[PDB]
Subunit: 310 residues, 2 copies
């Protein structure tokens, strides 16, 4: 498919599609994403890195912000420990095939002129707006800290310093991105990716909740996690197994079954799989088994590349 | 002794026992911060007088022209705020203060400073920060993120300054108690009273225009005092009695006709309070004495400031 449709595929929104099309005409163009460093790199990370790879394949220069200062403000621990996790994340992203340049937020988010602009943004940003933009990002705290409202203006100014053509993030970033769109002059094209459902179906996938498949999980860990995963028959919305099939698997997809239960099945698209499951022609245990074996193979080159370092 | 001179006309010392230990040192320092003010009024003068007390006790005095705090508190642009701070420095010098001056922005934007601000932001709840600013923050229907950065900015300012004593008005007491809670070194805090506004309506402040400026013309001083709140017998919230307590010299002679026994001569504010509570001294006699003595007290300050126009 053409570069626009490749970038648009499996995204939740593009703000705006018209301006992205204009960006694609340029010979030099850049896209950035930030990640708070995470002890485990899970399928949620992988979904976004795949989107960055789409962009690199469309001729964008990719920048990855290892967001150590934001993680610090978000009570994730001490800076030098966060940065060491950031280094490991960089290796994992490389193992995924990403071709990017990497920087720690702290390399530029602590100089005088940056800090003065954070304070200028602080004068323009209401507390109510800052908290609302952090609702899905802030780590749980019964006594919310000042650091929670510095976080979004820290991030907004980061996008300002980076000065790319495109900013990518999950839908939980949407309010911060729209805050930047109204505090800053220079407008970036925003691409927002969906946020995956946790494996037990209770809320979204997140590193703190341990409700995820990590890209370096063992094949039997993946099988076991999918076995116990929430996957009610006929139910597609909020079904994590259907999400993995939508966002990671390749089509045509073959689902093996005993002929006692209809024999092997071949699905040409995710939509065909959707109605198959909605009409209950496909049992969850047969969905799970095929999702698990195909996912294992997709993650194998990543896991292998990381294991050969030992 | 030095302790009693320092304590005189203060509202509290946190703590007296610590101050007594600080007085045992050959070398000791004390600092105070001022958001630059377009007029310098009796509230400022009261605090500068206390700094002069400390200097006379062997303290090295540091004055922070708190431009970045004023910036965060919506007082305008930094360039203009610094120009007002320069003007304030000249008024404080005309008061007789031997002090070193510094703009907060000279050190409050360094990377290690900003990093410790963010470290303090992790430790300070939003509720605590907002409560600490109740008497300081500019009124705002939609409170900004800058409001909760201000107190931790000020807390870290004392940490960097490393003085033995911090001086301020009673409106500062919550920020200072937050500092003593959060910082590894507890600084002695000397808090001066906040004066009552001329109409008795509330506290005196620059934003409410209910003050006497130290360079007000004698005619203006007389007009302000004449209209001031001063009910016979009432001492609390009486700004005219406050001026007699904090600025006038004793023994102090109240001119009235021999029709009323003098030329009532009083050698303590306590004896003045006795006569006024007893309704032996009419507010009009009190006002006329307070005005003419206050004019004489402020005259050398106003004269030194008027000389600057060649």
């Amino acid at each position: 498919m053409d570069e626009f449709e490749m970038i648009k595929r499996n995204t939740s929104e593009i703000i705006s599609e018209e301006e992205l099309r204009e960006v694609l005409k340029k010979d030099e163009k850049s896209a950035h994403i930030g990640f708070e460093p995470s002890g485990k790199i899970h399928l949620g990370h992988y979904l976004q890195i795949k989107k960055m790879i789409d962009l690199q394949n469309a001729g964008f220069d990719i920048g990855i912000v290892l967001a150590d200062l934001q993680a610090y403000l978000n009570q994730k621990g001490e800076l030098d420990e966060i940065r060491k996790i950031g280094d490991y994340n960089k290796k994992v992203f490389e193992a995924m095939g990403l071709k990017a340049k990497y920087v720690y937020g702290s390399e530029f988010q602590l100089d005088k002129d940056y800090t003065l602009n954070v304070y200028r943004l602080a004068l323009k940003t209401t507390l109510k707006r800052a908290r609302r933009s952090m609702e899905l990002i802030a780590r749980e705290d019964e006594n919310p800290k000042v650091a929670e409202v510095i976080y979004p203006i820290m991030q907004v100014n980061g996008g300002h310093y980076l000065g790319g053509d495109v900013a990518v993030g999950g839908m939980e970033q949407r309010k911060i991105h729209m805050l930047a769109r109204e505090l800053l002059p220079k407008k970036v094209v925003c691409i927002h990716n969906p946020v995956l459902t946790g494996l037990d179906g209770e809320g979204k996938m997140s590193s703190s909740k341990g409700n995820f498949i990590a890209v370096d999980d063992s094949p039997e860990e993946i099988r076991a996690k999918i076995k116990k995963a929430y996957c009610p028959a006929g139910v597609v919305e909020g079904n994590p197994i259907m999400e993995i099939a939508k966002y990671f698997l390749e089509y045509p997809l073959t689902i093996k079954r005993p002929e006692k239960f209809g024999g092997d099945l071949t699905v040409n698209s995710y939509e065909e799989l959707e109605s198959l499951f909605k009409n209950k022609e496909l049992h969850p245990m047969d969905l799970k088994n095929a999702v698990a074996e195909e996912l294992i193979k997709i993650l194998e080159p990543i896991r292998k590349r990381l294991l050969e370092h030992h």
